[PDB]
Symmetry: C3
Subunit: 336 residues, 3 copies
């Protein structure tokens, strides 16, 4: 059970909100699963008013890509920090044991890379995030976090041990953003990442985000970019929040089976209307669509969702079921 001698497999990561191809239940034995991520600092437009964020990302996206392995596997990540970045970075896996989650072994300055291996000995969805000494919160709130999903080798199970399956998985990273405003009441636009620092820490200390977004920007998961599913399909919704609590809800849907603390050896709860993702964690919910149409998937602090940005859509195809819901009488004049 010595990793140096086990089979190694390289996985190509995909951008959120998709999740790379993977097995749920597997007959494979433990492997060393190798991944690579390249840090990209970049200015991003995060709303439809032209507001920018001096952002920091793993692999160019918020959140970074989800890495999927099985319980008993070893994660082996090569973390690259190009010379075109200005700051030092690292990675802290909440699914790993020791050395500040791997942060102490992955400190990389612009122009450097490092490779970390850790045993993924516990099943569940876990946050990973950057955590450079002296500026931990700034790197995390600027976009550096994603999820490691460690599946049970047997796939997911209900409280009685019955198999649970998903047909499609989506990953939603929710980001509380702290964009500074100048004395004119407009959001500041910085020329460099380092310029935004001091102002940003002052907004952070208020504990009041200027924006709260799914996947890098207001409305990121809407329009052409809406999530999709079909009636009859079971979706796994992974939701990570590395800094602040959130409370996911599917409008017109449910959390059929939910691991809100995100740890698959614990029995899931069923029939949830709204679940809770503790800041610093990732959780997962399964839902099997039974009705077609456009659903909203959102943080059910409704101010945070509708005013600040924490809401996406899921467009679902299929047949309407009047036994589950029916309009008996459409809107019409009150009988007088």
């Amino acid at each position: 059970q010595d990793a140096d001698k086990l089979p190694h497999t390289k996985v190509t990561l995909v951008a959120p909100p998709q999740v790379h191809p993977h097995e749920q239940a597997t007959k494979s034995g433990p492997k060393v699963v190798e991944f690579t991520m390249t840090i990209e600092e970049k200015k991003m437009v995060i709303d439809d008013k032209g507001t920018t964020l001096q952002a920091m990302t793993f692999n160019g996206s918020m959140p970074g890509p989800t890495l999927v392995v099985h319980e008993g596997d070893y994660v082996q990540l090569t973390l690259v920090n190009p010379a075109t970045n200005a700051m030092p970075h690292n990675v802290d896996f909440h699914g790993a044991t020791g050395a500040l989650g791997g942060a102490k072994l992955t400190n990389v300055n612009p122009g450097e890379q490092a490779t970390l291996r850790f045993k993924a000995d516990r099943s569940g969805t876990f946050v990973y995030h950057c955590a450079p000494e002296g500026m931990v919160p700034w790197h995390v709130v600027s976009g550096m976090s994603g999820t490691l999903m460690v599946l049970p080798r047997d796939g997911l199970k209900d409280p009685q041990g019955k198999p649970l399956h998903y047909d499609r998985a989506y990953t939603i990273g929710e980001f509380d953003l702290y964009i500074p405003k100048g004395p004119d009441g407009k959001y500041k636009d910085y020329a460099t990442l380092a310029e935004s620092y001091g102002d940003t820490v002052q907004v952070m200390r208020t504990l009041t985000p200027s924006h709260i977004v799914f996947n890098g920007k207001v409305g990121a998961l809407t329009g052409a970019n809406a999530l999709t599913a079909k009636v009859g399909e079971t979706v796994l919704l992974i939701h990570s929040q590395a800094n602040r609590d959130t409370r996911p809800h599917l409008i017109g849907g449910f959390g059929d089976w939910v691991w809100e603390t995100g740890k698959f050896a614990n029995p899931p709860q069923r029939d949830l209307e709204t679940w809770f993702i503790r800041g610093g964690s990732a959780g997962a919910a399964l839902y099997t669509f039974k009705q077609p149409g456009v659903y909203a998937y959102l943080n059910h602090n409704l101010i945070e969702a509708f005013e600040l940005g924490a809401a996406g859509h899921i467009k679902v195809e299929g047949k309407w079921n009047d036994d589950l819901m029916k309009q008996i009488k459409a809107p019409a004049p009150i009988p007088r």
Copy 2:
């Protein structure tokens, strides 16, 4: 199991904090349970300093009345929006499947009504709330939410399946209010509901409520309006919070059995000191009183409870039990 052919029964709703008469375990088979609610926009005094809220309610109260059905029943609601209101409304049931919880099928302008039917296929306490396109949070924080309680046909059960009963049920809706202040530091008083809109959204975006109240106003559940019980009686406390998290606590009491996520097919937790209601959900706790006196039932963010309003009282009659608690020595001079 076609609702069109099932027996229909009409239920008369009662104002919070009571809950309409209903059975727990029932021998009845599935029914279509019909309810009616009329929306009332009205200015309300919400504190004892004369502060007003341009409020929006279902049936004239905050929260709206609790509707009680059994798992497998169909809820059939007629939603009326009189011409004396100024805004359009709808209803989103978190206990319903599809069409944005029914909101898409219940859009009613002043002078209109509509009737929605949905299968209540999951047990638990669920929030219902208004959700008109473009102004979802304003309608919810202005007072439009209540609970749908779907009881298991067999009544409530503990983790081992033993029957649990309540003698009386109370419904507590907790509302985070965002009342604007003018430049003189006083809460603004508006002539119309529409006048309060813009100022209200600015306060909402700060995420800091001006007041947090149970059942429409500071001290609503105190004095003549305190909840009541007797030693030996088991109470079911339903607590809904449609927009913001809260953490209920009974001072001098416990959550004997609690479903904090509010979904009765999951095993309850026992002996809770304080439980947690996620914004966008309703939860339920059972407690059997063992001591008489005046208890406080509150949000245990104590600033939110004592400074902002989120606290009520329960006056309990009966005999004091010195085996559970006794004053050994009353306050007296320190022995010198």
Copy 3:
């Protein structure tokens, strides 16, 4: 099962973060366990910038000491309020039944003491806190809270009933502080406790702490005062938050078994990355160290931890395990 006739034992309390010596599983039958606490109002330096807090404490510390008993025992506390204090105090045990948790029977003015006895009939970690009529939140946020740990007579158990043991226990009280600032942007320093009142309530109503600290001050559990353990040792981390939610996380570690709502008759959850302590409660986590080094134990709202103070360290001795984590390649130039 009449307490007046049972054996009485006096326990000497110890300062946080230690916990007085006690048994886990015990063959003892029910006892009356007697404790004494003396209230101390005192000005404390709470950060490294010279900021002071007009603090209020049980036994001179924040949090007050943890009291440990077994399920079925009676807690008998003598609460002393010296004449050198300026305010009246009391104590509300969340582990007690009736009389506002004992607050109604322990109102003591400066120069008085009182003795309360209550049956500790439920297992779990429970908050105790001061709660004087009319100024409940001020006394709690100024430092008056600690934990009562009621262990099952059989010791802690996992979800299947297997015994769980800890080798060492630590108690962490997390305090959201509301220090006023004057017009010059500097934290105010008061000559007396009563002087700080009005300004403090205004900061409290904003719901934004100026500081959030573990055990009375930024960095209290760091340096010479860091918690300690060894590889192979199982630690019990008790975390109390009497006013505000928090989300504990061990960097590079886990919550192997966690009772986040803190009530030991409920099955714990395993493998948690981050858990949640509801304001007004205490929870407990067990972790068996598997790697040596310096860990951080923190509130995983990272702004609250790193900017506001809610973070401590645990220094762990022992052997590094390259099978759990290994640096495959140290930071070095990117291959060109």
